[PDB]
Design an enzyme around this catalytic site. Structure first.
Site, PDB file in Angstrom:
ATOM      1  N   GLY A  30       0.767  -1.244   0.000  1.00  0.00           N
ATOM      2  CA  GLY A  30       0.000   0.000   0.000  1.00  0.00           C
ATOM      3  C   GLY A  30       0.797   1.292   0.000  1.00  0.00           C
ATOM      4  CB  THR A  31      -0.453   4.791  -0.390  1.00  0.00           C
ATOM      5  OG1 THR A  31      -0.472   4.975  -1.810  1.00  0.00           O
ATOM      6  CG2 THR A  31      -0.199   6.123   0.272  1.00  0.00           C
ATOM      7  CB  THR A  32       4.671   5.468   2.154  1.00  0.00           C
ATOM      8  OG1 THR A  32       5.314   6.033   3.303  1.00  0.00           O
ATOM      9  CG2 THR A  32       4.804   6.428   0.976  1.00  0.00           C
TER      10      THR A  32
END
Lengths: 244, 111, 198, 244, 243, 250, 242, 233, 241
Positions: A30-32
């Site tokens: 996923g996105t940080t």
């Protein structure tokens, strides 16, 4: 004789829950997102991938609020993160109903912890595919937490999860050593913008959008508030200034 | 002891001609000997060219109207936007009223 | 109330039941059969609250008929009257109790003996030579104490009922419109066509 | 979920047989033999105890012959624990019938009910069937002396003479050979002991290995009496027949 | 022929593999703990390892204050550890309400060990991969140590140790109680009893400790408390002067 | 949350065997030896206290348990399964008997209740059988002294004398030679100690051996005086000191 | 094993698709919509000559203005018809009017996906989908004469003409060519008879095939055997002419 | 590989994927194409309808939820009925209890939360339908995309279904043009019909084939079929 | 609690658990029903494996559902009791609410509906039973004969057989039962029933049992000697060739 990874609550021979470890993979995918704890509050920031020109700016809000003083951000399966917050929102309201006072952050952390842990006890439920960074200001200062799919959580000076967790942590540990006597609420916001841009190198093929929020005793009266307009532009310019 | 009912007065009228119908009502709302409101509308356009009024206990009247209006709304969703004929509305209202036969709506209702 | 009478003689049980159905100030019917056949050799009469009366009788009837089909066998009058008692004993402690008083008239084919059981809405059973429910008993009990013999023929038993019905017609305030009379013996259940002017 | 671990206890085979009922019948074919013989003046129940020790107390022991009613008794083949569960419901059923009709339960009605309970575990609930076969010995004023058998499928039948448990095939042929309709009870006692003695997997048939019972009408009383033979009484009757 | 290792049912050998594999989980965190009894106190020592410099060390703890008198140290993963804690706290409060007196240490252990035994028998519940050590000064039994495992087994101790390097500590203590003959630490103050426990963890593990490497919980008459970094630091000065 | 285990975990195999019961019995064989002997004026139940650590306190763990004032229990197999069975057996004696009849259940009936609980563990959804065999010794007015064994299947047998667990095969042989119908209680305890010695590898004393009896009523163990009909418990757990006395002349 | 309501890699529900194969093993059923009425015909298909053919009920009345023809596992249809009838009569009780054909079909299809093993959302107590397809024909004041094909997938299509069952693929190709907007009722009746005659294994007569129609005037009628025999006799003459 | 980890939604794959959810996504890709697009005054849905035979009707793609909100479907229609019914009730609740027109953004959050519960619990399957939700609440025109995984995105324009990648590229290129079409609904429908035809690989769009819906400032959610859409062909 | 779907669809479109319930029926003892002008006759075979049964008390295959309706079955005996009881309860219930005994078609439709219900409910297996339902409607003199099967399907028959070797006996009836002219007498109708069972059952007076239902609740099962007489006459017909 194997197949230990096919069912949730099952212990493998070495003592592991492979289904939770597979959920961790969904988070890493996923996105940080990050969290910085400062001298009177906490700052949350997150990366937002712009797949197309068609996504309306400033509209697909990721950072969420529980109550009025807690902020939550998560990496991994967004629907799972939303589900976890719906629980937190119910959990905090219940606490306020009985004890009058708004829920302390350590108290709220365990409420999420017991709930996420519960989803590793039965084969009829799937573990949570999110790591959650969250915190706020209570009766005795600022608190920052990170919650893993296993239900494990700890207090943090700085927290990072998702795609660019490596770049983020490497940059967070430099802040702890460079600022031993605490960092200010203003400073932390600007510094949060830099970390997100530096972690975007991991996903550098796509354009992105910055979203930041903060909770501070002196700057926001101990309530959760999003960063907008002139303050956000100031943080965006600062991150651009330290990239060349 | 708690009395769930009250009386808000008012009076309503309904006459039908050859190609028209009318439904009238006073706008005064009262409690005991006090006037609550001098202008409180009591006759409503429910859509599909139906006018409705429920008179007596105002909280039961407003509930009934509200429930019937919602009934019209769902009828459109369920039956391909079909117009609700006045006779159908009447039978539908009977079921609303009788569904509370043992805790009645204290209203006299006219469509 | 309605008239519900029973008398066990030598080899039969005789049941006499009121014919009127009165509600308010109007006598709605003068030919009402206040009995159900439970099995070929067991007959039940009933009196009490308006609805409960027929509903209880028909419910008991369905259960005894169900037993007969399952077992290919007929319950003894003693067994039927225990089943009825327990249903009433059950119902008296429920939300809305059956308000029905009954008489069970049966001929036990195994024992070769007639049997009469009086059971009230509380579930109070007792076996008797003669029985009555309601106000009827206040006249007939003492009359039968005097006239009844335990070895009377079915013909003597009918004469003895006529004497009970004549007394009720003379002294009781209500017009109950005569009685329907049934005989229960070894050959089953039959109706006495002419009693009104026998 | 749990779908992975479900045996599916209540399903048909391609052949149309019930897997579990079949395997339960196999289990019973290993249990000590029991025999019931109906005569004109009473019924006999004989049973063979399994794996006996010299230290096993027989006086306090009752594993195969149980009293259901003042007029009905059973011989058990299979799991004793399973049988006791059913025996208790049967005892309750007879008492319910008595409280309802003021008459002792007809033997067949009691049998049909137990057989109905066993049939349930065959068609719904996903539980294993009862590993039990019963012989029923009883009396009522409708059919007189009756003898029934019931197995794990919930099927029951009526017999003049029958065997359950181990070596039934061999035991039934021996009975079919020596049984006649106009039998006295004292003759039926001999036939039962002789049949067991022939089908035994043990060296010899002894008192400490047997449970024995009769249902007989009073030789002077005029009513039905049960007798569960005591060890010393069996030792006596075993010398009489010619087995010692 | 396979699935008897996934849920809590017997193997042909008579073993419950899921229980065995839960014991393995208790050593995942590589932390050793020990518990000893004094004259009128009970001390728990647990290794404190904070490998990440982004963590807040004050929140890293495997010692829990269950009730005013009872404390618990856990060897195992934290989410299961916190699960067990919340239950123990709830069970301790319910006992006090229902029966009018504070739940004893041995009674709480028996309770938690009963719950552990349930997961051992019923299939839908997985065992918790934790070993629970309870401590107090009971108003009847005096200083107490009771330990429960994922098998549902529980017993009382003179002293105990838990973790990967358990046996070093166990034999070390065993040798002391053959030398001292009595079955407790013959010391008046808890401060000197804490020192004993730290000294004996050093000699058994062969490693020196700083104030941040240790976690200490003390139980006295009507009170259980955990020591701050500085209380340990003060206690560490005492052992340095003794040697 | 949602228990999806509504089906049996113990089912029949093609051969007729009930796998889980058989495996439970296999767990009982691994367990430490326990035995029971019935004398004319009492019953004795005995076992070895297998300690998990020399730092553990064996006094805090009783393998022998009082069920009623007149009934006691011992086991071989899995300790925790026994502990929870003891709790349930104590409760059922009240709920299913004492609260109805104002007196304690006779030995055979409490045994019957224990067996029922274990039979349910064989058939109910989502459970495994109990991994224990029990020995229950007791007295009641109308039966006298009795001794029972309860297997994981839920089956129970009355015994003059028997042993369960590790060395049960050899111990049953040793008991057969020594048991008679004229044994006094002090004789039975003597045999019990001798039989248990063949099983015990290590230290043999009152600290490593657990032993209890069902004998005479003990008025000094009652706790109160006044009611003549209340005479005191027949169950008595012997002390470490009392065991050692019979071992000095053994 | 595998979950009941479970998607295939292709994006389809296993149980629904397998249920569609059971319907292909069913008896042929044909519907034709005209401006004079809708016609429904079925193949009886009796397994033995000893079977009493007129006890084969594959045409059922739902209300006076709505009729139904079934194909597949016809035992599965009983509770669908029961629901349909109750829906129709119930609608008339609340609204003092006739239910729309479209709304009735929608109500029947609402049941079709209510299968599973104690699921999320609402309550679905049914172990498997229905193994039967339905042809629903009727008339209402709003949309006139209508023919619907309701599937165990929960989706329903409106058709000018439709064939379902074993002969459906060959029959639908035939119905494609034949159907036009201005067909009479008698032409449609003869058309149903013409296609059934082709796809059947047995020779078609008034015993092994059944006709029915729905008109505004007389409502839904199932033709008696003497009437259908005469239309078969009439079809034989017309085919022979050209 | 895939063999083992696709048995139910409750199960994670070694890489972190939920195959049951992914297979549900595939049903959308098979479904007939539909397009959404908005300006500041109006929002539009354009849908391509699918038939079985030339003797069958074309299945409806657009559902009205309230006077100000509505959606189009791609995939399993029965699931779209279940979801549209729910959203109708949620819209209904907002009006009756609060006298408030439900915000389109909140409609999305609710649909997201409803889809999620199916993706985490044993037994239940995921939903097998994609949705394009258009509305006009207190903050102008909105367009939302719903995926049965739970993900809901607010967009200016988008497409779902088979060959929908063609239409999406057209909108991505024409973004600056159609967003300024304020107060002229016709010229926004014209842009939607031009968008959907970029996904036509098979057939021409006809009078009983095309479906259009519009909501806006002074326009309540209305559907156009048959002779109503004739001028956009 | 337990709701596992046991009856499900397989790739080729079959419900295997229903298919296997039919196999159980094929294993059961043969049952046959034939209707005449003014009667219906049910014939059933008894097993010969064990010749030590007590016929007085042993459950018979022909069960009375009401005084005018009979039910015979082929398949799992234990299952049949469940179906019979439900049917007998519904019979008494129908008399209570409608004030009229059940029609044979109605009782059949109810029994068939129960069977179907057990094919699409969770946690249950289909009934391993096919039934023959026969009788006379209230005040009606026209004979009725119906069959049901595990799937839930039902229909009426002039003549039908179920169970083991039913292929053989059905083959017999197809070339021996004339629909144009049915059996005129009760005796003429019983003869045909015994004839058909003699195709599948070897010489056995014990083995064949017959029940005759006439209009207006007139049901009587035949004794062994009576049936034996029919066998004695039929076997003398062959030797004439």
């Amino acid at each position: 004789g194997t197949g230990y990874d096919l069912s949730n609550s099952v212990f493998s021979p070495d003592g592991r829950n492979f289904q939770v470890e597979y959920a961790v993979k969904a988070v890493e995918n996923g996105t940080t997102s990050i969290g910085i704890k400062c001298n009177d509050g906490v700052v949350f920031a997150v990366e937002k991938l712009i797949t197309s020109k068609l996504l309306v700016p400033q509209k697909n809000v990721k950072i969420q609020v529980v109550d009025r003083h807690i902020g939550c951000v998560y990496s991994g399966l967004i629907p799972d993160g939303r589900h976890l917050v719906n629980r937190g929102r119910e959990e905090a309201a219940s606490f306020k109903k009985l004890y009058k006072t708004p829920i302390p952050i350590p108290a709220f952390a365990d409420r999420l912890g017991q709930y996420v842990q519960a989803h590793t006890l039965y084969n009829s439920v799937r573990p949570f595919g999110v790591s959650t960074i969250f915190g706020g200001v209570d009766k005795n200062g600022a608190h920052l937490y990170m919650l893993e799919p296993s239900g494990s959580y700890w207090g943090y000076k700085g927290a990072a999860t998702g795609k660019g967790r490596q770049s983020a942590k490497a940059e967070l540990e430099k802040l702890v050593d460079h600022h031993p006597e605490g960092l200010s609420a203003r400073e932390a916001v600007k510094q949060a913008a830099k970390i997100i841009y530096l972690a975007h190198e991991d996903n550098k093929e796509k354009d992105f959008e910055l979203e930041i929020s903060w909770c501070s005793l002196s700057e926001t009266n101990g309530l959760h508030k999003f960063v907008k307009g002139d303050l956000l532009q100031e943080a965006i310019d600062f991150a651009q200034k330290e990239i060349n | 002891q708690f009395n769930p009912y009250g009386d808000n007065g008012g009076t309503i009228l309904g006459i039908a001609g050859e190609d028209f119908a009318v439904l009238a009502g006073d706008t005064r709302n009262i409690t005991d000997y006090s006037i609550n409101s001098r202008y409180e509308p009591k006759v409503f356009d429910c859509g599909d060219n139906i006018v409705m009024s429920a008179n007596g206990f105002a909280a039961d009247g407003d509930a009934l109207v509200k429930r019937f209006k919602n009934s019209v709304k769902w009828y459109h969703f369920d039956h391909n936007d079909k117009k609700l004929s006045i006779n159908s509305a009447a039978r539908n209202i009977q079921h609303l009223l009788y569904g509370k036969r043992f805790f009645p709506y204290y209203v006299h209702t006219i469509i | 109330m309605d008239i519900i009478l029973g008398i066990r003689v030598q080899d039969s049980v005789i049941l006499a039941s009121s014919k009127a159905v009165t509600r308010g100030i109007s006598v709605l019917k003068d030919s009402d059969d206040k009995t159900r056949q439970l099995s070929p050799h067991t007959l039940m009469s009933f009196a009490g609250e308006a609805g409960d009366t027929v509903q209880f009788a028909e419910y008991i009837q369905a259960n005894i008929q169900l037993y007969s089909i399952r077992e290919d066998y007929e319950l003894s009058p003693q067994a039927v009257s225990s089943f009825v008692r327990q249903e009433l004993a059950k119902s008296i402690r429920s939300r809305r109790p059956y308000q029905v008083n009954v008489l069970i008239g049966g001929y036990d084919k195994k024992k070769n003996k007639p049997e009469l059981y009086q059971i009230d809405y509380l579930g109070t059973k007792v076996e008797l030579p003669y029985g009555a429910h309601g106000y009827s008993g206040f006249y007939t009990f003492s009359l039968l104490d005097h006239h009844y013999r335990p070895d009377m023929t079915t013909e003597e038993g009918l004469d003895l009922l006529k004497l009970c019905v004549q007394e009720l017609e003379k002294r009781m305030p209500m017009d109950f419109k005569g009685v329907i009379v049934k005989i229960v013996d070894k050959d089953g259940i039959r109706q006495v066509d002419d009693f009104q002017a026998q | 979920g749990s779908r992975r671990y479900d045996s599916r206890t209540t399903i048909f085979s391609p052949e149309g047989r019930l897997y579990q009922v079949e395997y339960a019948l196999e289990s019973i074919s290993h249990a000590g033999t029991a025999i019931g013989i109906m005569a004109s003046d009473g019924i006999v129940l004989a049973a063979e105890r399994k794996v006996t020790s010299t230290l096993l107390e027989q006086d306090t022991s009752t594993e195969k012959l149980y009293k259901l009613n003042d007029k009905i008794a059973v011989a058990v083949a299979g799991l004793t624990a399973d049988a006791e569960i059913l025996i208790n419901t049967a005892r309750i059923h007879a008492q319910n019938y008595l409280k309802t009709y003021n008459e002792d339960i007809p033997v067949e009605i009691l049998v049909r009910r137990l057989s109905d309970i066993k049939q349930g575990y065959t068609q719904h609930g996903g539980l294993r069937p009862f590993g039990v076969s019963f012989i029923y010995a009883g009396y009522d004023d409708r059919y007189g002396y009756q003898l029934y058998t019931s197995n794990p499928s919930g099927n029951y039948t009526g017999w003049k003479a029958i065997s359950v448990g181990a070596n039934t095939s061999a035991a039934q042929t021996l009975l079919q050979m020596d049984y006649k309709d106009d039998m006295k009870v004292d003759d039926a006692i001999e036939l039962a002991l002789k049949t067991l003695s022939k089908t035994t997997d043990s060296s010899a048939l002894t008192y400490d290995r047997l449970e024995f019972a009769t249902i007989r009408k009073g030789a002077n009383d005029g009513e039905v009496y049960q007798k569960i033979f005591k060890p010393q009484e069996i030792k006596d009757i075993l010398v009489k027949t010619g087995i010692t | 022929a396979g699935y008897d290792r996934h849920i809590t049912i017997f193997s042909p050998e008579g073993r419950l593999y899921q229980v065995e594999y839960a014991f393995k989980a208790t050593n995942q965190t590589n932390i050793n703990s020990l518990a000893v009894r004094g004259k009128d106190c009970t001390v728990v020592i647990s290794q404190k390892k904070v490998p990440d410099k982004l963590l807040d060390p004050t929140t890293v703890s495997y010692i829990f204050c269950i009730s005013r008198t009872i404390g618990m140290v856990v060897n195992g993963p934290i989410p299961d550890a916190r699960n067990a804690a919340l239950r123990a706290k709830a069970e301790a409060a319910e006992f006090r309400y229902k029966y009018g007196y504070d739940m004893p240490c041995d009674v709480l252990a028996k309770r938690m060990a009963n719950l552990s035994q349930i997961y051992t028998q019923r299939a839908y519940m997985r065992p918790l991969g934790v070993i629970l050590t309870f401590v107090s000064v009971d108003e009847e039994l005096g200083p107490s140590i009771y330990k429960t495992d994922p098998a549902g087994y529980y017993v009382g101790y003179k002293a105990t140790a838990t973790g990967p390097k358990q046996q070093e500590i166990t034999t070390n203590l065993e040798n002391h109680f053959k030398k001292s003959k009595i079955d407790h630490i013959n010391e008046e103050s808890w401060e000197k009893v804490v020192e004993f426990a730290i000294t004996h963890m050093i000699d058994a593990l062969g490693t020196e400790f700083s104030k941040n490497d240790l976690e200490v919980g003390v139980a006295t008459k009507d009170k259980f408390f955990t020591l701050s970094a500085e209380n340990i630091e003060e206690r560490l000065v005492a052992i340095a002067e003794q040697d | 949350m949602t228990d999806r285990y509504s089906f049996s975990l113990t089912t029949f195999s093609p051969s007729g065997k009930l796998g889980q019961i058989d495996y439970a019995l296999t767990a009982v064989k691994q367990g430490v030896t326990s035995l029971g002997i019935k004398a004319t004026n009492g019953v004795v139940i005995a076992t070895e206290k297998k300690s998990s650590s020399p730092l553990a306190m064996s006094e805090t763990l009783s393998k022998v348990s009082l069920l009623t004032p007149d009934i006691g229990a011992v086991y071989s197999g899995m300790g925790p399964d026994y502990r929870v069975l003891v709790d349930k057996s104590r409760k059922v004696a009240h709920t299913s008997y004492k609260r109805i009849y104002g007196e304690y259940p006779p030995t055979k009936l409490l045994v019957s209740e224990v067996a029922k609980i274990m039979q349910e563990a064989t058939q109910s959804g989502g459970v495994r059988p109990f991994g224990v065999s029990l020995l229950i010794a007791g007295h009641d007015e109308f039966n006298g002294f009795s001794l029972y064994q309860v297997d994981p299947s839920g089956s129970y047998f009355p015994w003059k004398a028997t042993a369960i667990g590790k060395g049960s095969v050899a111990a049953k042989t040793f008991l057969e030679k020594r048991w008679n119908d004229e044994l006094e209680l002090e004789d039975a305890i003597h045999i019990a100690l001798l039989t248990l010695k063949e099983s015990v590898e290590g230290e043999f004393n009152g600290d490593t051996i657990e032993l209890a009896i069902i004998g005479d009523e003990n008025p000094d163990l009652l706790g109160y005086t006044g009611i003549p009909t209340d005479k005191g418990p027949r169950f008595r757990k012997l002390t470490s000191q009392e065991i050692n006395d019979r071992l000095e002349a053994l | 094993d595998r979950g009941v309501s479970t998607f295939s890699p292709e994006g389809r529900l296993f149980q629904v698709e397998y249920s569609l194969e059971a319907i292909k093993l069913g008896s042929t059923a044909i519907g034709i919509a005209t401006k004079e009425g809708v016609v429904l015909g079925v193949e009886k298909r009796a397994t033995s000559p000893l079977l009493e053919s007129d006890s084969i009920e594959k045409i059922v009345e739902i209300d006076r203005h709505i009729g139904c023809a079934m194909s597949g596992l016809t035992a599965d249809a009983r509770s669908m018809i029961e629901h349909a009838r109750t829906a129709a009569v119930t609608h008339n009780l609340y609204y003092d009017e006739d239910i729309n054909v479209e709304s009735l079909t929608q109500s029947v299809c609402d049941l079709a996906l209510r299968f599973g093993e104690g699921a999320s959302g609402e309550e679905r107590l049914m172990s498997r989908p229905f193994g039967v397809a339905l042809l629903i024909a009727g008339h209402d004041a709003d949309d006139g004469y209508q023919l619907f094909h309701a599937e165990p997938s929960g989706t329903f299509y409106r058709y000018n003409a439709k064939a379902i069952g074993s002969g459906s693929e060959g029959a639908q190709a035939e119905l494609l060519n034949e159907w036009h907007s201005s067909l009479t009722l008698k032409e449609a009746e003869l058309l149903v008879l013409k296609i059934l005659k082709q796809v059947m294994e047995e020779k078609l007569d008034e015993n092994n095939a059944q006709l029915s129609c729905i008109t505004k005037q007389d409502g839904f009628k199932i033709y008696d055997n003497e009437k259908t025999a005469e239309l078969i006799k009439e079809l034989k003459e017309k085919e022979a002419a050209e | 590989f895939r063999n083992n980890y696709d048995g139910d939604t409750v199960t994670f794959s070694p890489t972190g994927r939920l195959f049951q959810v992914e297979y549900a996504l595939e049903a959308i890709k098979q479904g007939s194409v539909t397009v959404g697009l908005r300006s500041n005054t109006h929002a539009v849905l354009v849908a391509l309808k699918r038939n079985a035979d030339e003797l069958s009707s074309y299945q409806k793609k657009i559902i009205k939820c309230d006077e100000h909100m509505g959606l189009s479907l791609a995939g399993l229609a029965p699931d779209a009925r279940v979801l549209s019914n729910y959203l109708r009730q949620q819209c209904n609740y907002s009006s009756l209890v609060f006298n408030r027109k439900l915000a389109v953004e909140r409609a999305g959050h609710l649909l997201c939360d409803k889809a999620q519960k199916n993706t985490q619990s044993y037994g239940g399957r995921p939903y097998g339908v994609g949705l394009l939700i258009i509305g006009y609440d207190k903050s102008g025109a909105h367009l939302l995309e719903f995926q049965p995984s739970g993900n809901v995105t607010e967009l200016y324009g988008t497409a779902i279904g088979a060959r929908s990648q063609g239409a999406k590229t057209y909108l991505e290129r024409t973004l600056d043009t159609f967003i300024k079409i304020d107060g002229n609904p016709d010229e926004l429908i014209k842009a939607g019909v031009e968008a959907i035809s970029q996904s036509l690989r098979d057939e021409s769009l006809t009078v009983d084939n095309l479906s259009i819906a519009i909501v806006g400032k002074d326009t309540p959610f209305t559907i156009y079929d048959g002779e109503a859409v004739a001028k956009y062909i | 609690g337990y709701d596992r779907a046991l009856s499900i669809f397989s790739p080729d479109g079959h419900i295997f658990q229903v298919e296997y319930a039919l196999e159980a029926v094929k294993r059961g003892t043969c049952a046959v029903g034939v209707k005449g002008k003014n009667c219906v006759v049910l014939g059933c075979e008894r097993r010969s494996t064990l010749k030590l049964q007590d016929t007085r008390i042993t459950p018979s295959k022909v069960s009375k559902i009401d005084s005018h309706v009979v039910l015979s079955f082929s398949g799992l005996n234990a299952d049949s009791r469940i179906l019979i009881e439900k049917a007998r309860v519904e019979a008494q219930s129908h008399r209570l609410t409608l004030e009229d005994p059940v029609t044979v078609e109605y009782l059949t439709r109810y029994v068939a509906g129960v069977q179907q219900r057990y094919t699409q409910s969770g946690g249950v297996r289909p009934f391993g039973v096919s039934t023959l339902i026969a009788g006379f409607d209230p005040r009606d003199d026209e004979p009725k004969l119906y069959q049901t099967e595990p799937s839930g399907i039902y229909s009426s028959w002039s003549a039908q057989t179920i169970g083991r070797n039913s292929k053989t006996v059905r083959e017999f009836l197809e070339k021996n039962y004339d629909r144009k002219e049915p059996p005129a007498t009760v005796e003429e109708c019983v003869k045909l029933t015994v004839r058909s069972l003699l195709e599948v059952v070897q010489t056995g007076a014990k083995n064949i049992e017959i029940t005759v239902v006439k209009p207006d609740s007139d049901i009587v099962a035949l004794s062994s000697e009576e049936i034996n007489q029919y066998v004695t006459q039929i076997e003398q017909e062959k030797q004439e060739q």
